[model samples]
Target: SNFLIPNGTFFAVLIIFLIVLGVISKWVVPPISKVLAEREAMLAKTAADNRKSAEQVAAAQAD
Candidate 1:
């Protein structure tokens, strides 16, 4: 039992922690990142459309 105490015990705990961390990162992080990226893209497209509309109105007035 001495071989499995102290150092070995700590190593096992650390390994378990790392495995759980990896699983959560794999299953949870990517979806959250994808959602955030989609939101950013949508906002960018809306801004671009607004700018184009403003430019078109200005051009019509100038003409």
Candidate 2:
């Protein structure tokens, strides 16, 4: 009932798909992960600074 599976074209298509997937994983994933990591670090630092400022304000208010 199927034709593409008879001529081995299906395997070729799968190979091509894997190659593109590999290229994206190798070339695209690292930069995206790096950017995400940087953003996370920036957010953490901002939160910590905000907490410190809030603590200072609270201390001043207590005085």
lDDT of each: 0.92, 0.93
- Tens digit per residue, CA lDDT, model 2, 1-63: 675456767789999999999989989998899999999999999999999999999999999
**How much is 11 displaced in model 1, in angstroms?**
2.0
Candidate 1 lDDT over residue span 1-63, tens digit each: 567556757888999999999988998899999999999999999999999999999999999
**Which is the leading candidate under TM-score?**
2
User: Candidate 1, which segments miss by more than 4 Å at Cα?
Assistant: 1-6, 56-63
TM-scores for the candidates: 0.62, 0.64
Look at candidate 2 and tell me the lDDT of residue 29. 96
Report the lDDT of model 1 for residue 39.
Answer: 99
Query: Pick by lDDT: which candidate is best?
Result: 2
TM-score for candidate 2, please give it.
Answer: 0.64
Deviating ranges (above 4 Å) for candidate 2: 1-6, 53-63
Per-residue lDDT, model 2, residue 59, is 98
Cα error, candidate 1, residue 55 (Å): 3.8
lDDT of 2: 0.93
